[PDB]
Amino acid sequence: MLLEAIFHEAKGSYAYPISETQLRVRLRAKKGDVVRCEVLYADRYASPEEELAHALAGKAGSDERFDYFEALLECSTKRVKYVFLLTGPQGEAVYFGETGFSAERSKAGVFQYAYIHRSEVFTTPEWAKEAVIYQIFPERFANGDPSNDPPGTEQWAKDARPRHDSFYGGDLKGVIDRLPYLEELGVTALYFTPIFASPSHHKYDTADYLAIDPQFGDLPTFRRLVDEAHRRGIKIILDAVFNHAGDQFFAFRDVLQKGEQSRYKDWFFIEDFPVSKTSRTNYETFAVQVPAMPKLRTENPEVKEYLFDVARFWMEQGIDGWRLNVANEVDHAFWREFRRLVKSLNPDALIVGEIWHDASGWLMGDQFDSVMNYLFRESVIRFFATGEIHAERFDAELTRARMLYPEQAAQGLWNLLDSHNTERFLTSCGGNEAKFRLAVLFQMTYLGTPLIYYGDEIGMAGATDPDCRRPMIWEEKEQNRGLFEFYKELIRLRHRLASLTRGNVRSWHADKQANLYAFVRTVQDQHVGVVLNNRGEKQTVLLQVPESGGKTWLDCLTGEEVHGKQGQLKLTLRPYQGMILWNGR
Numbered sequence: 011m012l013l014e015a016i017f018h019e020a021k022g023s024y025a026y027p028i029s030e031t032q033l034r035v036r037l038r039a040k041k042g043d044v045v046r047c048e049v050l051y052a053d054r055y056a057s058p059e060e061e062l063a064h065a066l067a068g069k070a071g072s073d074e075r076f077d078y079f080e081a082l083l084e085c086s087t088k089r090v091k092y093v094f095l096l097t098g099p100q101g102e103a104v105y106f107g108e109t110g111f112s113a114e115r116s117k118a119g120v121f122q123y124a125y126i127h128r129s130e131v132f133t134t135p136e137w138a139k140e141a142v143i144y145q146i147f148p149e150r151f152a153n154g155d156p157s158n159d160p161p162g163t164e165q166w167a168k169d170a171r172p173r174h175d176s177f178y179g180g181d182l183k184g185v186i187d188r189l190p191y192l193e194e195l196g197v198t199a200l201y202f203t204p205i206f207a208s209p210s211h212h213k214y215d216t217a218d219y220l221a222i223d224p225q226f227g228d229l230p231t232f233r234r235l236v237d238e239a240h241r242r243g244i245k246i247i248l249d250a251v252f253n254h255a256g257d258q259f260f261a262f263r264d265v266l267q268k269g270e271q272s273r274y275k276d277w278f279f280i281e282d283f284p285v286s287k288t289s290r291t292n293y294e295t296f297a298v299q300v301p302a303m304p305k306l307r308t309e310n311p312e313v314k315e316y317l318f319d320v321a322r323f324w325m326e327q328g329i330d331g332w333r334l335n336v337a338n339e340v341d342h343a344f345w346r347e348f349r350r351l352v353k354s355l356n357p358d359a360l361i362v363g364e365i366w367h368d369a370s371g372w373l374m375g376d377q378f379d380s381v382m383n384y385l386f387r388e389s390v391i392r393f394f395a396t397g398e399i400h401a402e403r404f405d406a407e408l409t410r411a412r413m414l415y416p417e418q419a420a421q422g423l424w425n426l427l428d429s430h431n432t433e434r435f436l437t438s439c440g441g442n443e444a445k446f447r448l449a450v451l452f453q454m455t456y457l458g459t460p461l462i463y464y465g466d467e468i469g470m471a472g473a474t475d476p477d478c479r480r481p482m483i484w485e486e487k488e489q490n491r492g493l494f495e496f497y498k499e500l501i502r503l504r505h506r507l508a509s510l511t512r513g514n515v516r517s518w519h520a521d522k523q524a525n526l527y528a529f530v531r532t533v534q535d536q537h538v539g540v541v542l543n544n545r546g547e548k549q550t551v552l553l554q555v556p557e558s559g560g561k562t563w564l565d566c567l568t569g570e571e572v573h574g575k576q577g578q579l580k581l582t583l584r585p586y587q588g589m590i591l592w593n594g595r
């Protein structure tokens with residue numbers, strides 16, 4: 011077996027503690043090469059003339075080239091060491107350790123996890139674990155106070171097809187007036203996009219971090235929303251744009267005035283002075299060269315404390331967490347101290363990061379709790395909507411990303427279908443609601459936090475900005491209540507099955523020819539298995555169901571019942587039908 015292709019490291023995503031006495035270990039190797047992989051360990055200082063402990067590393071999954079094994083090590087003391095024992099297709103074991111590969115346990119070496127400090131155990135909020143959140147674009151959700159509307163605020167109709175200039179008067183007031191609907195849907199939190207004082211129409215160029223933009227509301231109405239949302243089991247996550255600021259930022263506009271004379275000149279990455287010409291950027295901007303957005307020197311103690319204050323202020327109003335905008339561009343130092351702040355000032359506050367590449371570094375339990383699962387959305391779009399990938403690839407992609415980070419974080423990724431920055435999903439699906447529903451079913455059942463884009467729950471359709479940003483349909487008789495109802499159930503069903511919340515995943519069936527997939531979430535003994543038949547035809551499949559831990563399941567959706575013949579579960583699914591089989595456990 012190709013040992014060059016075998017991996018492990020006493021850290022990060024391959025060696026972390028799941029408590030102050032237990033230690034998780036993952037190891038990978040080529041798909042095929044390894045059959046059995048057991049981990050032999052013992053307390054580090056333990057005397058040589060003693061016995062080692064054992065533990066069978068279970069094959070947790072396989073992507074398009076590797077096989078992943080995972081096993082839990084019991085460390086009564088917080089100190090531990092350990093070596094692997096990888097077997098191949100021909101029972102020819104090998105020992106894997108910090109020194110290399112060798113036949114003799116000793117010559118193999120031994121990995122080491124010095125000590126497991128209780129303060130370094132990845133720990134995320136409890137409500138977070140079982141959430142289901144609703145992304146809200148304030149301006150397009152609901153207008154509850156037409157006074158605050160900006161001039162020429164075009165009319166609010168289902169026939170609207172907004173362009174880059176539209177305004178509709180969406181505000182905080184309406185959001186409050188709709189709390190009832192929101193509550194009915196079953197969401198347990200509302201992640202808002204930016205809402206602080208800003209000139210633009212998106213509010214990403216903060217003008218006053220400490221004040222709600224006028225057109226949306228005021229500190230009173232916000233507290234109103236926070237209080238009114240809370241007493242309904244719904245929390246409030248806000249978009250913190252720390253990477254860069256708005257050119258109306260008090261600090262910045264001063265540097266434009268005073269110049270080198272300003273006490274805030276070293277608060278930005280400015281070229282020379284003059285600064286902020288019509289377009290020629292005489293300073294560093296968050297993007298390629300956007301004028302209205304000068305980068306904030308987050309390494310600077312002044313800048314750092316200012317935002318940390320902007321942080322303490324808003325949490326005083328009772329918000330439950332932050333969605334870190336373009337997080338991957340501020341010093342880990344800042345990000346670490348941020349957590350310490352936020353968390354001392356509130357243990358259940360959630361820090362969700364937005365990184366568009368590998369976020370492993372920020373996900374070691376000392377910075378973000380989770381980040382946007384941009385990977386999930388790709389595997390979802392290409393599998394259900396475009397049909398660019400079959401269920402074997404869909405299994406691969408999902409599985410490879412699942413192994414990307416410590417479970418604490420894996421379990422917390424915000425799985426979304428779309429955003430305000432993308433065409434609506436029902437559109438990506440062509441309009442074939444059969445496909446949409448299927449994807450949603452998967453979303454409401456897969457590992458991680460489902461994130462609902464305002465509107466999709468009842469039928470919205472559209473192209474990336476600004477067509478996806480159409481005004482929310484409230485007219486009872488223009489909302490796909492079938493959908494809305496479909497959502498509610500899934501959502502409730504998700505809250506019910508303690509397996510679909512804190513469980514893990516495991517691939518159960520993949521048929522590249524049938525384009526049918528299926529996985530299994532398991533918490534204790536409880537098993538729930540989702541059978542997704544993604545194809546415009548009716549099919550039948552025999553899912554390997556060892557009669558061991560369950561030989562009869564109930565379809566949580568259509569209540570139908572069913573059992574397994576000789577450990578083989580026969581099933582037939584209507585086109586695009588999806589099945590959620592429970593094992594009662």
Ligand SMILES: OC[C@H]1O[C@@H]2O[C@H]3[C@H](O)[C@@H](O)[C@@H](O[C@H]4[C@H](O)[C@@H](O)[C@@H](O[C@H]5[C@H](O)[C@@H](O)[C@@H](O[C@H]6[C@H](O)[C@@H](O)[C@@H](O[C@H]7[C@H](O)[C@@H](O)[C@@H](O[C@H]8[C@H](O)[C@@H](O)[C@@H](O[C@H]9[C@H](O)[C@@H](O)[C@@H](O[C@H]1[C@H](O)[C@H]2O)O[C@@H]9CO)O[C@@H]8CO)O[C@@H]7CO)O[C@@H]6CO)O[C@@H]5CO)O[C@@H]4CO)O[C@@H]3CO
Pocket residue numbers: 174212214297300336364366431474475476
């Ligand atoms: O405040 C800034 C915004 O922050 C937040 O957004 C962040 C993203 O979430 C995050 O992922 C990241 O983006 C990276 C991206 O994911 C990477 O892939 C890469 O981008 C490259 C991309 O992959 C390539 O495809 C290509 O882009 C092509 C693109 O695919 C294609 O569609 C087209 O794009 C044109 C648009 O279709 C067209 O609409 C227009 O774009 C307008 C836009 O419509 C308009 O609204 C305005 O944008 C505003 C926006 O409305 C505000 O909301 C705010 O955006 C924030 C987001 O909301 C946050 O979620 O501010 C924006 C401006 O201040 O202006 C746009 C500009 O015209 O034109 C587009 C063409 O220019 O063609 C392109 C081909 O270029 O190349 C990409 C870059 O090479 O890298 C990204 C960054 O690393 O970061 C985001 C924040 O920067």
Ligand SMILES: [Ca+2]
Pocket residue numbers: 153154155156157158159178179180181225
């Ligand atoms: Ca309004």
